[PDB]
Amino acid sequence: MLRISQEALTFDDVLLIPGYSEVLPKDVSLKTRLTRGIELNIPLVSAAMDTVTEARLAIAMAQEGGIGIIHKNMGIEQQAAEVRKVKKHETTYPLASKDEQGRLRVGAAVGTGADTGERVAALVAAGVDVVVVDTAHGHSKGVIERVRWVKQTFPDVQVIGGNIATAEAAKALAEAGADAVKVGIGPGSICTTRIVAGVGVPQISAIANVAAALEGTGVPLIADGGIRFSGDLAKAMVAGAYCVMMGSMFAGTEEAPKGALSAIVHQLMGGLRAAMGYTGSADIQQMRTQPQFVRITGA
Amino acid sequence: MLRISQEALTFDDVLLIPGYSEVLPKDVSLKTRLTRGIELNIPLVSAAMDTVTEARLAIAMAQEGGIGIIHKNMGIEQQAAEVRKVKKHETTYPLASKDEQGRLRVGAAVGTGADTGERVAALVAAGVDVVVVDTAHGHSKGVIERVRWVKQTFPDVQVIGGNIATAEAAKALAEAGADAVKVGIGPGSICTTRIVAGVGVPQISAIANVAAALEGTGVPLIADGGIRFSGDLAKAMVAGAYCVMMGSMFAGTEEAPKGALSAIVHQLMGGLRAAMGYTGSADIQQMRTQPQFVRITGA
Amino acid sequence: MLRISQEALTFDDVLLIPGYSEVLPKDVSLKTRLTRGIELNIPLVSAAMDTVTEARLAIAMAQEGGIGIIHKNMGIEQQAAEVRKVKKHETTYPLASKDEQGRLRVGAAVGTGADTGERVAALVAAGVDVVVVDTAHGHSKGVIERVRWVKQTFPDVQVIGGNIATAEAAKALAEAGADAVKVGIGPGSICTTRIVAGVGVPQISAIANVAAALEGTGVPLIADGGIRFSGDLAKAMVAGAYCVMMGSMFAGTEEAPKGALSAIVHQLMGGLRAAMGYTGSADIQQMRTQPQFVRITGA
Amino acid sequence: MLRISQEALTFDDVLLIPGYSEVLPKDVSLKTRLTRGIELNIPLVSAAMDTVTEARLAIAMAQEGGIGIIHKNMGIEQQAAEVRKVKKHETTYPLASKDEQGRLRVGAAVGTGADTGERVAALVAAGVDVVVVDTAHGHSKGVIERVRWVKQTFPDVQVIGGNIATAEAAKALAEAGADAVKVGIGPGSICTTRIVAGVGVPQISAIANVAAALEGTGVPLIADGGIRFSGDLAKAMVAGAYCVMMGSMFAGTEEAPKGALSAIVHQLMGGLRAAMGYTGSADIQQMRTQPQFVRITGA
Ligand SMILES: [Cl-]
Ligand SMILES: [Cl-]
Ligand SMILES: [Cl-]
Ligand SMILES: [Cl-]
């Protein structure tokens, strides 16, 4: 009698099935798309969290082949200054994420507040590569219509909308002109969205439903939340993510506002390379479309 | 070979799927029905437990937009006096639950003992709004026939019967003239009904089976038991409850026989509003009929 | 590809669904059959364990309306003496289990060793009511052929065979002339049969498969193992057991070789009566055939 | 939308169903095949781990009726010397595993490194019985083509390939000429393959898929990983393993590079014999093909 749409799976419900392989971890390609217009050399994004991404950590992420999204828990002028610091950082890093001018890539988050138009303007004038319209509920008037507005007003900036967890949301963001979507609503066990609101979609099913909805559109999806180990990251990719956002795991690093960020990155990319080796996936498109899961009981 | 009627789900088996939303938590309507004849401004009832609801806590609940049910672990004259204190409390509280005379609403519990007729009479003469015929097993001769008797003898009082957990019980209460039913048998893990008697129905399935049985009748159902966080409350509503009863969570408050009851109420209603925001539900009827669950493994 | 016969359920996988009731716990009948020829006033048997049942505890069990099975971890002459002590105990206990001569009922266990014929003879000459051919694996030549032999050689004694856990075993025991079968192989989580041999059948499915196989034969089944609380006992009955054997739970009692056995009995029968009240079962035959389970996730 | 091939089961998801038995633990036969050409008197292999198998432990294993695989975390000349020590050990042990010359059997592991050809040559010249081409991912060019090469270059040595976990891998190894395959990828909960790479197949399903793929070929499979108790071992056999590899459980023994290895062996074989007794399996071929599982919830 309950209105149950499906059974939904998280990282711990599934394992990657090994497949034939002739490719070594060190030899696979980790190149992917952050957005329609933006490629990354590794599928790794740092979160728009005030304990995680400002200019220093965003610089390190771009140098590694990923990208940082500058958080929006600060003033407009501070946020544009963080963006400028990244875009002016003078560049040893053959993998760096860079724009057509050879400047490091950066993103910046915006919300739905009264200040959003002015914020987007200052960030775009500062040379931002991507504006991330980023709330706890991306399938909402505030997010979608803001994504529509950025796309129509600043047509040479990339726009990401999130956070979403359903096929329907992905399409509503695609129709608004989103160049990528970010996936993750209540993705961890015992996070405050589940406890407080009773709301959430287990992340492996969320990513897969959104990947299926977006197939053939050219719109990438970013998996944000619920990743604890590098094996989770591999699972997110096989479920259809184009890259993965990490937040609190980077929060203790030198670069954040325990050690170098580099170590953490290399360990995360190490496990992913291992998982590509096990599944026989030579590049990210193979990893996203070919390996299969087994479902497990957790016994 | 076992006589298993179904697999049944509790709060932890399910999450609310976010849906399109243009409504903010602060803007949704929490208006609902306690019974056929009685509306509440918030879907919240305090339990007929001797550590929870007497006149002081019942007053606070009515002022908040809900209602208190005075417990029956006391004498008949004490219980009527508790009711009178509520009905005479002189009323800053625009949400108050009130009768057609502007007096705060109150309920009172009765059992099946030899004293029930006299108890119901004293409570009705004291101006009670609702009589709650309330045992550990509402699908029983003692409860149903007592509900029939109150309805036939005092036709201007509202009557609730409980506790039940099945479609069949809901109908048997509806046929007896019940103006609402209360749902909850063995609703928590490791509660004494499960340990001692082996008896229970997981609460999300219980509420849904009873909501389905009652559809189109105009008879509301109250979810009583197994709610630990405000997210559980939201889930109870989506499963079809019209409001939710809380007991031990209020037991430490100033008003009960750690802080003000108000804080607890506002936090509980806060999470519900958040969950209505996430699901795009502007009012309680939307919340009860439109949002969907995903089933989770608990991995 | 695995040879999986079914998914099998234990006590914690299921709950009793409340049903219509007009019967109070105190008013239900607990009368049942231990065997074809032997009735008990309560469905409770004490185990043939050297820490549980000798003459003193067997006497108390019979006085309560159940029966004790004297354990076989002792000499033949000691075991016959334990039986004689019970049969001569002079009988305040209106519920007592008694034979056609007014003597308390007793059972005694035998194994498969070289001494079995002589043991059965001494026990029968001592006036035993039931011989329990009792090993860790009742579906075996040693048990079945011993049951056949007792039935053919001492046709005026009742014979129970165990322990079994399948339809096929029940039938093989019925064909050998067994007057009842005892059910329970690897019935607890983390018991030594599961850890050491990897062998076991969850007890709710075991009881149901054996009850289904025995339907219409007049052969009762005794549920032995995995019962921790009185609610488990109720579940065993609904799954089709005619009575239930308890071992280590009685091991600390005065009567065993923390308090009086009586307290434990009354608490166990209290929960069962409560469960009969909840399900509307006036007697044991109703309890075994009418109430239904819901399956639960354990979330 | 997820690419889930199946639900897959580990040891804790299943129990052996007892079946009719007239055979005692002590009387069953534990004779089996390690490879096409090699029989063992017990289905037990010690792992190619640097804390487990060198000449002393390999000698003890062969004397017990099993076999040791000498680990490859050492130099080529050291490994051939370990093999020679086993082949020259002068032989009280009626169960010993021996070649056609009366010398104890031994195996040795090789990897995929540049040194493999020279390693295989030295080991074969030292009189090795079986070469185990042994990596973390046997379904790979490095393993399969190395198995092909050993078979084509040294046609009088037995070759095992591993580790694998799928029907497809088993066949690819069979086609390369493998005389047996070794099964086990991410077989334990929380092992580093699952945490780091997100990769694994629950071991009962792995063994069954590989056994089904290999049926009628004459190629045995060895279950390697995830066995904690002797009951797990029995389950591995019923799922279709011909024998079972143990590693860290032997790591504390006298013979390894807490007590005698013998005790551990006898306890492991004790539980297996018990499980054969329960299921009525007189020999290993009966155990692999006849007993059935029940699936359990872990409640
Ligand atoms: Cl690898
Ligand atoms: Cl919200
Ligand atoms: Cl009751
Ligand atoms: Cl046995």
Numbering used by the authors:
A (entry chain A), B (entry chain A), C (entry chain A), D (entry chain A): 1 to 91, 205 to 370, 426 to 467
Sentences copied from the publication:
Inosine 5′-monophosphate dehydrogenase (IMPDH; EC 1.1.1.205) catalyzes the first committed reaction in de novo guanine-nucleotide biosynthesis. This enzyme converts inosine 5′-monophosphate (IMP) to xanthosine 5′-monophosphate (XMP), which can then be converted to guanosine 5′-monophosphate (GMP) by GMP synthetase. Guanine nucleotides are essential for signal transduction and DNA/RNA synthesis and IMPDH therefore plays a pivotal role in the growth and proliferation of both prokaryotic and eukaryotic cells. The enzyme mechanism is thought to start with a catalytic cysteine attacking the C2 position of IMP; an NAD+-dependent dehydro­genation then generates NADH and the covalent product intermediate E-XMP*.
Here, we report success in this endeavour and present the crystal structure of apo IMPDH from P. aeruginosa at 2.25 Å resolution. The structure is a homotetramer of subunits dominated by a (β/α)8-barrel fold, consistent with other known structures of IMPDH. Also in common with previous work, the cystathionine β-synthase domains, residues 92–204, are not present in the model owing to disorder. However, unlike the majority of available structures, clearly defined electron density exists for a loop that creates part of the active site. This loop, composed of residues 297–315, links α8 and β9 and carries the catalytic Cys304. Analysis of the Ramachandran plot revealed that 99.3% of the residues were in the allowed region, with only two outliers: Gly226 and Gln458. These two residues are located on flexible loops linking α8 to β9 and α13 to β12, respectively, and the associated electron density is relatively poor. Furthermore, PaIMPDH possesses a structural motif that indicates that this enzyme belongs to a group of IMPDHs that are susceptible to inhibitors developed to target CpIMPDH.
